[PDB]
Each structure stands twice: as structure tokens, then as C-alpha cells.
């Protein structure tokens, strides 16, 4: 079927390869999985390793992480703002690695207020800590910008990290 090979392609000399061999099942493309938003649907496929890999369709939730404090919580994926690859993708709100996105942001808020025995732990954690301004404004409103740092098209789980100052400032200005 679909194959991944250099033997239907031109050489560096501009010449053409000539065949003598029918295509292997070792070399083997498959059609791309389309992860979007909506109800979760997961269709496995069997692979050559004797194990299954999972085709994410329509994931509307992700496991997101806040940098620097070494934490994470689940939250809901709402929108896709941006992508490097195309504009077309963004409009359909496809989810593929290194798309900037938008999340519910609620659990992070909740967490950070918890960041008598309790009470003095807080005061210690308040000390020697600060947060970027562009972060906190968004985090107040209850929306945030994050990146999806796992490939959802072959695991059917979408995990992401939350943008921090250096990189956040770039993606912001691209909008």
C-alpha cells in the first residue's frame, strides 16, 4: 500500500531508480489521525511491535502542567489560537504537537491559593516566589495559553505544558 521509501524518488544526479522488488509490509505508511475537539473517540490499530497504538480523534481534555512549580492538573481544551504549520488547521481546531491552545485554567487558580498548621506553610511558600505579569492577568480572568507537548495522534492522550515568560511573549505578539 502506502510506503516510505527512496525507491520511487529521484537521485541526486537527477536520474531515476529502477525497481526489481515488490514493496514490503515493513515499510508502511498509514493515513493521518485527526484529533480535534468534541467527544473522545479512540480507535486502536495493531502495529508491528505486537502492540496497539491509539488514534486520538476529537480530544477535548488534556493533562496540563505549570512550569517551574513542578505540578500539573487536568483541564478542558477550549480553542486553538495558533499553529506554526498552517492557518487552515487552527480554524478546524486540530490538535497536533506545538499548537498553542486555550484551557479552562480553573484548577491552577485553586492550587495557587493553597500554595493552623497549614497557614504558616503558605507564608513560607509566598516567600522567595514570584510570577510573570502576563501570566497572572490571564490566570485571573480564567483563561491561559498553553502548548501541547505530547503527540495526540498516536497515543490518544493530549498533554501540554503552560507557557512561561520568554516563550509566551513571542506567541502573544504573533496574534
Amino acid at each position: 500500500g502506502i510506503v516510505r521509501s527512496r525507491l520511487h524518488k529521484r537521485k541526486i544526479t537527477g536520474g531515476k531508480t529502477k525497481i526489481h522488488r515488490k514493496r514490503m509490509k515493513a515499510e508502511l505508511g498509514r493515513l493521518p489521525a485527526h484529533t480535534k475537539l468534541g467527544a473522545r473517540r479512540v480507535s486502536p490499530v495493531r502495529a508491528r511491535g505486537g502492540n496497539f497504538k491509539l488514534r486520538g480523534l476529537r480530544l477535548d481534555t488534556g493533562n496540563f502542567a505549570w512550569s517551574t512549580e513542578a505540578i500539573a492538573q487536568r483541564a478542558r481544551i477550549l480553542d486553538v489560537v495558533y499553529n506554526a504549520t498552517s492557518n487552515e488547521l487552527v480554524r478546524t481546531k486540530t490538535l497536533v504537537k506545538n499548537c498553542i491552545v486555550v484551557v479552562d485554567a480553573a484548577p491552577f487558580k485553586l492550587w495557587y491559593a493553597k500554595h493552623d498548621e497549614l497557614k504558616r506553610k503558605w507564608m513560607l511558600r509566598r516567600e522567595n516566589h514570584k510570577i510573570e505579569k502576563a501570566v497572572a492577568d490571564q490566570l485571573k480572568e480564567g483563561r491561559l495559553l498553553a502548548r501541547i507537548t505530547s503527540r495526540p495522534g498516536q497515543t490518544a492522550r493530549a498533554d501540554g505544558a503552560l507557557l512561561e515568560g520568554a516563550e509566551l511573549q513571542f506567541y502573544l505578539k504573533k496574534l
Binding site: 512561561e164 515568560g165 520568554a166 511573549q169 504573533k174
Partner: peptide, 24 residues
């Protein structure tokens, strides 16, 4: 931190993926 726009001209940004350098 802050951007260095001398490096950047990309629509994807560029970061070093080995070690976080984007901390403020």
C-alpha cells in the same frame, strides 16, 4: 525571561528542548 528576536524569524518560535531556558 524575555525574547531575543535576533535569533527568531520563525512562526513556530525556537527553543532548546534539552533544558528549560524560558524561566524568568
Amino acid at each position: 525571561h524575555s525574547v531575543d528576536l535576533t535569533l527568531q524569524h520563525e512562526k513556530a518560535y525556537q527553543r532548546q528542548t534539552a533544558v528549560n531556558e524560558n524561566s524568568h
